[PDB]
């Protein structure tokens, strides 16, 4: 279970990093947003 | 601890999926955004 | 591993809560968004 949870957490870390970048871009209006 | 962490990770997966849908909608301007 | 995963999950919970607040603000146009 721990091996599977670790993979799930790592996938979440990647997805959350991507969301943070997109949301900061929206908040800041970067690149014409 | 693992049982509680698993529930926390599953809740995160649901929340992150929801955020991805909302952020793609904002980025794409879907439905008048 | 479980101790490290727990810290990672807790950090994700904080980041996801922050994203939910920012995305709701964008969706609702709060504060001039």
Coordinates of C-alpha atoms in Angstrom, one line a residue:
Chain A
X1 CA 0.0 0.0 0.0
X2 CA 2.8 2.4 0.9
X3 CA 4.5 1.9 -2.5
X4 CA 1.2 2.7 -4.3
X5 CA 0.5 5.7 -2.0
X6 CA 4.0 7.1 -2.6
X7 CA 3.4 7.0 -6.4
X8 CA 0.0 8.7 -5.8
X9 CA 1.6 11.4 -3.7
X10 CA 4.4 12.0 -6.2
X11 CA 1.8 12.3 -9.0
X12 CA -0.1 14.8 -6.9
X13 CA 3.1 16.9 -6.3
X14 CA 3.6 17.2 -10.0
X15 CA -0.1 18.1 -10.6
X16 CA -0.2 20.6 -7.8
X17 CA 3.0 22.3 -9.0
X18 CA 1.5 22.6 -12.5
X19 CA -1.7 24.1 -11.0
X20 CA 0.2 26.6 -8.9
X21 CA 2.0 27.8 -12.0
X22 CA -1.2 28.2 -14.0
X23 CA -3.1 29.9 -11.2
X24 CA -0.3 32.4 -10.5
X25 CA -0.4 33.1 -14.2
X26 CA -4.1 33.8 -14.1
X27 CA -3.8 35.9 -11.0
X28 CA -1.0 38.0 -12.5
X29 CA -2.5 38.1 -16.0
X30 CA 0.8 36.8 -17.4
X31 CA 1.0 36.5 -21.2
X32 CA -2.2 38.3 -21.9
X33 CA -4.4 36.3 -19.5
Chain B
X1 CA -1.2 6.2 10.1
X2 CA -1.2 4.6 6.6
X3 CA -4.9 4.1 6.7
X4 CA -5.4 7.8 7.5
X5 CA -2.8 8.9 4.9
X6 CA -4.5 6.9 2.3
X7 CA -7.8 8.7 2.9
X8 CA -6.0 12.0 2.8
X9 CA -4.3 11.2 -0.5
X10 CA -7.6 10.0 -2.0
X11 CA -9.3 13.3 -0.9
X12 CA -6.4 15.2 -2.5
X13 CA -6.8 13.3 -5.8
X14 CA -10.5 14.3 -5.9
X15 CA -9.7 18.0 -5.1
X16 CA -6.8 18.2 -7.6
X17 CA -8.9 16.7 -10.4
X18 CA -11.6 19.3 -9.6
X19 CA -9.0 22.1 -9.7
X20 CA -7.5 20.9 -13.0
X21 CA -11.0 21.1 -14.6
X22 CA -11.7 24.6 -13.2
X23 CA -8.2 25.9 -14.2
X24 CA -8.4 24.4 -17.7
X25 CA -11.8 26.1 -18.0
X26 CA -10.3 29.5 -16.9
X27 CA -7.3 29.1 -19.3
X28 CA -9.5 28.2 -22.2
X29 CA -12.3 30.7 -21.4
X30 CA -14.9 27.9 -21.5
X31 CA -18.5 28.9 -21.0
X32 CA -17.9 32.6 -21.1
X33 CA -15.0 32.7 -18.6
Chain C
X1 CA 9.1 6.4 4.2
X2 CA 5.8 6.8 5.9
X3 CA 7.1 9.8 7.9
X4 CA 8.3 11.5 4.8
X5 CA 5.1 10.7 2.9
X6 CA 3.0 12.1 5.7
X7 CA 5.0 15.4 5.5
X8 CA 4.5 15.4 1.7
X9 CA 0.7 14.8 2.1
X10 CA 0.4 17.6 4.7
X11 CA 2.3 20.0 2.4
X12 CA -0.1 19.1 -0.4
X13 CA -3.1 19.7 1.8
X14 CA -1.9 23.2 2.5
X15 CA -1.1 23.9 -1.2
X16 CA -4.4 22.5 -2.4
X17 CA -6.4 24.5 0.1
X18 CA -4.6 27.6 -1.2
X19 CA -5.3 26.7 -4.8
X20 CA -9.0 26.1 -4.0
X21 CA -9.3 29.6 -2.5
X22 CA -7.5 31.3 -5.5
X23 CA -9.5 29.4 -8.1
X24 CA -12.9 30.1 -6.4
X25 CA -11.8 33.8 -6.4
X26 CA -11.1 33.6 -10.1
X27 CA -14.4 31.8 -10.9
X28 CA -16.4 34.3 -8.8
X29 CA -14.5 37.3 -9.9
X30 CA -13.9 38.3 -6.3
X31 CA -12.1 41.6 -5.6
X32 CA -12.1 42.7 -9.2
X33 CA -10.8 39.5 -10.8

